[PDB]
């Protein structure tokens, strides 16, 4: 009988022919197989359903942005964001090479496009052979290496021939046989484009690839390998239905210009035509502002690339144009109707948290659990996983090694929390006080005389954030209601942590132009009220909100300490004040309290990681005759319990939400004219949600280290991001 007809049985030990010391791994891509195809038509796909039911499955594998074939396939086999592995789209221009990349051109085989270390190169360096029957990058010499058996891409090769060849490769003698294999099919991507994702044609394509996977499995069974092979069935992205009525043309606002080139689609990019001469001198900001807030409920938004949501990690490469566009679901953008393909086809490329962009993942074999359904994870985590299946040490990458251990019968790698590399000190009281220039109102209660586990636990119930910032000088400042990690190198707080219960009340009093000098920290001129007084360029904001006073009735005066302020634009205060005066109270009511950590972010070189000291010094600004460092973003992490009966101080299990809010000196991003503040501030927050791990990378902080969950369980928590359901 066939493999699909056999009953599902646990493979607790690999059942291998004597000529196999261990099971191979096969990575099998079904291009453009959106996660929902299996949600809805699983009854029509018996083979893929058995792999899912007898294996390890997630309803949604999150792809990378932009959700295109080449960036995502290459992310899968490198563990890297496209901005790091260099393949940021199927078509690219590189201003330093002055070259264009495309899939149907000679440049596809130019090794200079492909960065990082794909898994077959990792394997080569560690004496493991590879056999690839198509995979982006696998027919290109990368690090002077090619797969041991590889095929130049040719989409005309019949699907059956591809599967048959891998089955012959598996019969080679040990000294020639690969241990890692790839297979790739162009369906159901092709039918999804030509006829739309919801069509009888896509269904026929799904049935066709399901039959083909069964041909593979039956071949493995014939070879005695169907219980000696770790199968990863995967896709690169999902599929959306495009419309000629949902297509933006920039010539509507710019006129019929030809001095710019637009990469059309849902993740459009813009550069001048006169390159490389004007690639950097072109006035991108003027163009972006001419395209901002032009329509009510505008379905596209221009972004200079450092200002895109950090969760997309789409800016560091010089192949990413300085101007990009963010598109609503189902919408696309081109310069004009002549600079695009057909406007009514299936398409992809959109935000990688859109539901219809989500991808397929099934793991089947000795190493994978049987009948396990796990929460969503990003495809950059798969490289580490394949390294564990193959016995390989991973190259440095963006996956969190160990975060997928719950997919495995017997985890290979036991992860550890990162060490604290900061220099921690106690900050003593200095008895010298200076005039800050403040004009505190009469109802503000002064701190007349300046000169603890329970208080400590209340403020940091999961352990204090750890300082990963190498050799950075930090002292902890304890208050009754919050804890501060204070930077002695920057003279501003790196984080503040406090807990906010459902019944806690906020104060109504004003506290304008009022601060109290923290005698435990060195006094800076940019600590004083007089620095920010009538300062049109810059104001200051608080990390812990002074209106929150759990025990007393007035403004919480300890939150007015100079150790609790950060430089803050007036425009961003609209967001920050609404967040802390309105949203936080509702979230505490919805979540039975929330614990909060917030702080500044400095990522001036837009690489998603904290800046070195030399980078900070280069980006200092003189404002009112003083050097000042203005954060690029502000982060906030909200934690509460899975069970609503528990307060954030007694959680059996954690519920985490994180955000990395851009710190812009206007609110043009939100097109605020005619909108309720309730709507647009919360909409901005949702768009700029992030993984906890994203916050960790960009601040050099590590969270939750005193929790009793295993490190791998905490990595799952910290790598999660909610999908926007359509
Ligand atoms: C995703 O993982 C990537 C791999 O670890 C990581 O990229 C690495 O980033 C570092 C720092 O930018 C680079 O290291 C060196 O870079 C230059 C020389 O090119 C030096 O001046 C630096 O001091 C440093 O020694 C690595 O070259 C780079 N590796 C790769 C493959 O790109 C990304 O930073 C990670 N992304 C995020 C958001 O965490
Ligand atoms: N919008 C759109 N792009 C397509 C379609 N078919 C192929 N492409 C794009 O054209 C390139 C080559 O596709 P392949 O030849 O199917 C890729 O960048 C792919 O995304 C289609 O029907 N619509
Ligand atoms: N290794 C490859 N080299 C070149 N083109 C490829 C390769 N793999 C897939 N393709 C093509 O990429 C296109 C699909 O891209 P996408 O629509 O972004 O999913 C189709 O034209 C495929 O034939
Ligand atoms: C860039 O390359 C193109 C070839 O595609 C060539 O026409 C142009 O002269 C080059 N520009 C420079 C500055 O070398
Ligand atoms: C692509 O594959 C088909 C196999 O059916 C073959 O006819 C064609 O010649 C191949 N193209 C190249 C360039 O090898
Ligand atoms: C629109 O573009 C022009 C450049 O042609 C620029 O001078 C102008 O400042 C832009 N408008 C806005 C509102 O930024
Ligand atoms: Ca940085
Ligand atoms: Cl690059
Ligand atoms: Cl391009
Ligand atoms: Cl629009
Ligand atoms: Cl597309
Ligand atoms: Cl195994
Ligand atoms: Cl715990
Ligand atoms: Zn694809
Ligand atoms: Zn496609």
Residue numbers in the entry: 170 to 620, 629 to 903
Please give sentences taken from the publication describing this entry.
ENPP1 (Ecto-nucleotide pyrophosphatase phosphodiesterase 1) is a type II transmembrane glycoprotein originally identified as a negative regulator of bone mineralization.
We co-crystallized the ENPP1-ΔSMB T238A mutant in the presence of 2′3′-cGAMP or 3′3′-cGAMP, and determined the crystal structures at 1.8 and 1.9 Å resolutions, respectively. We concluded that this structure represents a post-reaction state of the first hydrolysis, and modeled pApG into the electron density. pApG adopts an open conformation, in which the nucleobases are far apart from each other. The adenine and guanine moieties of pApG are accommodated within the nucleotide-binding pocket (N-pocket) and the guanine-binding pocket (G-pocket), respectively. The 5′-phosphate group binds to two zinc ions (Zn1 and Zn2), which are coordinated by Asp358/His362/His517 and Asp200/Asp405/His406, respectively. The guanosine moiety of pApG is accommodated in the G-pocket, formed by His362 on a short helix and a loop (residues 510–517).
